[PDB]
């Protein structure tokens, strides 16, 4: 796939990354999985998030909600909508809270954003999570 | 952790397994992640699910739904409730449709079931998916 408008390349093999958590957004009618590279997953599990370490990459994968034919009360993934990424580099991405933001749309992997300044949209909401280093997700608890 | 009543041991390192899908069960008020070992993940991605191959292991992880303090419309994991497993061995588990079923409850990982016949409960529902080799989950679509 083409790079994002700010120059960020799509991380190869993100579909093999370990699970950090899951979510459902009522207003978007979607289901989401949150995965990370090994630096991200080690930080998540030890609570090294004030701040997240350089080299951590988070991905969020979104699907439209659909219902299971044999069990209609189970909400399950339908069409794939987007892959959203945050790349930690405190020096390189100082103007956007130390994070490099990027999104690719659909099974076609089309890069999102009108121009190289697109990540200001992402900051509009993610600045609300400034006390948690711009990340909303609380890693899911496991034994 | 202690073994299940049918003698199945808790699969070690399941939290490091690759993602097959996600779900939300309305009547249970939860969120779930579906992971698998590398035998199951190969079979899922290649469509080799008639039947699933011997050695495939599927896990479902469940959390109570909670809402994000900074974004109330985001439904997110709360307390960890259970880990559910299905281990494919067509010969060994021929009496339960070719799958070895087991559940461990909570952060303490307490084995579920009154006695060695507990998996007949699981079969009561999972026999509804008998045409799909007793598995409801459709692997989530990714590029
Ligand atoms: C989840 C997200 C993630 C995971 C990291 C995190 O902060 O939890 C990424 C990589 C990402 N987003 Fe953002 N996003 C928002 C909220 C509330 C959540 C948590 C709940 C859930 O699982 O859905 C997010 C909020 C918003 C938002 C407010 C309307 C906007 C405009 C955005 N996000 C925008 C972006 C991006 C701009 C292209 C981008 C690359 C994001 N998010 C990455
Ligand atoms: C999901 C499940 C999985 C993953 C494999 C699959 O079939 O998709 C495992 C390892 C497992 N269960 Fe079962 N379960 C049910 C349904 C509808 C789904 C798909 C939707 C979702 O993601 O939630 C399941 C249904 C039922 C059910 C009907 C009320 C019962 C009684 C059970 N499941 C019982 C069990 C087990 C008995 C202890 C067990 C080990 C299960 N499920 C494993």
Residue numbers in the entry:
A (entry chain A), B (entry chain B): 19 to 161
Manuscript text:
Cytochromes P460, defined by an unusual porphyrin-Lys cross link at the 13′ meso carbon, catalyse the oxidation of hydroxylamine (NH2OH) to form N2O under anaerobic conditions.
The crystal structure of as-isolated (ferric) McP460 was determined to 1.36 Å resolution with residues 19 to 161 observed in the electron density maps. McP460 exists as a homodimer, with each monomer consisting of a twisted five-stranded antiparallel β-sheet, two α-helices and two helical turns, Fig. 1A – a protein fold similar to that of NeP460 12 and NsALP460 13 from AOB. The defining P460 covalent cross-link is evident between Lys 78 and the 13′-meso carbon of the McP460 porphyrin ring. No hydroxyl modification of the porphyrin (observed at the 5′-meso carbon position in NeP460, but not in NsALP460) is evident in our McP460 structure. The distal water ligand in McP460 is 3.1/3.2 Å from residue Asp 102, and we note that a bound hydroxylamine substrate displacing the distal water would likely be in hydrogen-bonding distance to several additional pocket residues such as Arg 43, Arg 50, Asp 102 or Arg 121.
